[PDB]
């Protein structure tokens, strides 16, 4: 509102302290943003890693596990999402977020590799290893379908899951 | 005073395999807190006096 | 008499700035509500079956 | 029952206390510890039939097989009453003779 003018500053000086509270409010929301992201994502205490060899009973997670080829180590769907969307003059300033995109990728990778291997046990203590085909059997048993169904229809279920995970890729 | 890069935490590789499980053999009981505001002070202002 | 025009410009710009700040506050509140919902969903559905 | 709502772990109960302008909950939670290593299998072949556990999981320390509950180690001998049968074992991937 002054653009580096002395008399403008002098005249503004007698209006009180509006600017102090304005800057206070802006700083408050700026801090709240980082608090918000950290609350949403930082749900784990460690950084789990997927094993080098992957045999998850026929399920195929290649489209969502991180890709070492890209330096950012973001999976395929994450790359599609990043390529999809597209967006200091006289006092405006943009502050960088506290957490870089690489760190966000690391949290997502840790969560996903934990839930593939451990199940839900890593959310309430120390992660416990459990074969995946033996985990889906527990996961049906929680919706009323006895586990006997899963072991007798493993291949068909795996194929359905892969087809769905490809269809979502194409749609996105 | 030292400035450094943030550490996301420790790093372990869970030893996944297709015929091995881990089952607990003991337990602990923990007590934790959670604090939540529910109210703030009630204020009244008179124009003409102010 | 230049001071009068300076004052008019000052008050106009100040009012515009206040309006912008208020809009930002409203939007931030809405986004915070959305992010709280997102955190609840990630805790309840990713880390366990709902 | 909703995970991580009140207390990190398995919830048991809670206690309220007052505060000058708010409330303070003390959550009591259950946390397992002191894990072990075991060899598992999804079903048991016997007489051509396949047996699945009613509630539990098959484990083996290296020589003998047991059924245990999931959240605590309590091995038990396999009997026809804590297991149920479904078909013959020619389609399950991971059956073990016993
Ligand atoms: C999981 O699915 C992907 C499909 O995206 C498979 O990757 C394909 O593999 C075949 C054979 O190796 C190649 O001809 C294709 O070019 C691959 N697709 C892409 C996009 O690279 C992958 O092989 C599957 N996982 C496993 C273990 O087979
Ligand atoms: C269960 O067995 C696995 C496989 O031996 C153990 O994982 C290894 O533990 C040793 C400790 O001497 C580490 O040096 C290895 O790096 C571990 N392997 C991997 C792939 O990380 C595991 O510790 C055993 N579990 C328990 C509770 O003893
Ligand atoms: C489970 O853990 C508890 C403590 O975490 C163990 O109880 C301890 O046992 C040792 C050895 O007998 C005693 O010196 C401690 O005083 C005990 N702690 C308490 C609080 O009484 C218990 O032994 C563990 N369970 C097993 C099977 O070892
Ligand atoms: C696996 O557990 C079984 C069950 O306890 C062990 O078999 C017993 O071994 C003891 C000797 O330590 C004998 O007195 C029992 O007769 C055996 N049978 C039973 C039913 O208890 C077996 O030794 C364990 N194996 C390992 C490698 O620890
Ligand atoms: C767990 O994974 C191992 C590792 O591949 C499997 O062992 C293979 O079994 C087949 C039999 O169908 C053999 O042809 C391979 O040579 C074995 N691999 C090795 C490295 O020896 C094992 O079958 C898997 N178990 C289950 C229940 O799926
Ligand atoms: C489990 O037991 C069955 C039957 O007792 C075994 O199946 C036999 O295996 C031998 C050796 O390969 C064959 O000569 C027979 O023809 C098989 N009989 C039948 C009815 O299939 C089986 O090999 C044993 N082991 C496993 C891992 O299943």
From Swiss-Prot, chain B:
Q: What is the effect of changing residue 13 to L?
A: In strain: Omicron/BA.2.12.1
State the source organism's domain of life: Viruses
Q: Which residues are glycosylated?
A: 18, 26
> Function of this protein?
Precursor of the fusion protein processed in the biosynthesis of the S protein and the formation of virus particle. Mediates fusion of the virion and cellular membranes by functioning as a class I viral fusion protein. Contains two viral fusion peptides that are unmasked after cleavage. The S2/S2' cleavage occurs during virus entry at the cell membrane by host TMPRSS2 or during endocytosis by host CSTL.
**What protein is this chain from?**
Spike protein S2
């Amino acid at each position: 509102i002054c653009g580096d003018s002395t008399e403008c500053s002098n005249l503004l000086l007698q209006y009180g302290s509006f600017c102090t509270q304005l800057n206070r409010a802006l700083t408050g929301i700026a801090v709240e943003q980082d608090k918000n992201t950290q609350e949403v994502f930082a749900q784990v205490k460690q950084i789990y890693k997927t094993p080098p060899i992957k045999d998850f009973g026929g399920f195929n997670f290649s489209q969502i596990l991180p890709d070492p080829s890209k330096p950012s180590k973001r999976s395929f769907i994450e790359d599609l999402l990043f390529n999809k969307v597209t967006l200091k003059f006289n006092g405006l300033t943009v502050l960088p977020p506290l957490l870089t995109d690489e760190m966000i990728a690391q949290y997502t990778s840790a969560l996903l590799a934990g839930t593939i291997t451990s199940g839900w046990t890593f959310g309430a203590g120390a992660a416990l290893q459990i074969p995946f085909a033996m985990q889906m059997a527990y996961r049906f048993n929680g919706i009323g379908v006895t586990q006997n169904v899963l072991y007798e229809n493993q291949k068909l279920i795996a194929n359905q899951f892969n087809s769905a995970i490809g269809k979502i890729q194409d749609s996105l | 005073i030292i400035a450094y890069t943030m550490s996301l935490g420790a790093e372990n590789s869970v030893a996944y395999s297709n015929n091995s499980i881990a089952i607990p053999t003991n337990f602990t009981i923990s007590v934790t807190t959670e604090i939540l505001p529910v109210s703030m002070t009630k204020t009244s202002v008179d124009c003409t006096m102010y | 008499e230049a001071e009068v025009q300076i004052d008019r410009l000052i008050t106009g710009r100040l009012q515009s700035l206040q309006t912008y700040v208020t809009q930002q506050l409203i939007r931030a509140a809405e986004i915070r509500a959305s992010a709280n919902l997102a955190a609840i969903k990630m805790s309840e559905c990713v880390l366990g079956q709902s | 029952k909703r995970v991580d709502f009140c207390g990190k772990g398995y919830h048991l109960m809670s206690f309220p206390q007052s505060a000058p302008h708010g409330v303070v909950f003390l959550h009591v939670t259950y946390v397992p510890a002191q894990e072990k290593n075991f060899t598992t299998a999804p079903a048991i072949c016997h007489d051509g039939k396949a047996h699945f556990p009613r509630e539990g999981v098959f484990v083996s320390n290296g020589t003998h097989w047991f059924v245990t509950q999931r959240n605590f180690y309590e091995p038990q001998i396999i009997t026809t009453d804590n297991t149920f049968v479904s078909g013959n074992c020619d389609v399950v991937i991971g059956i073990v003779n016993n």
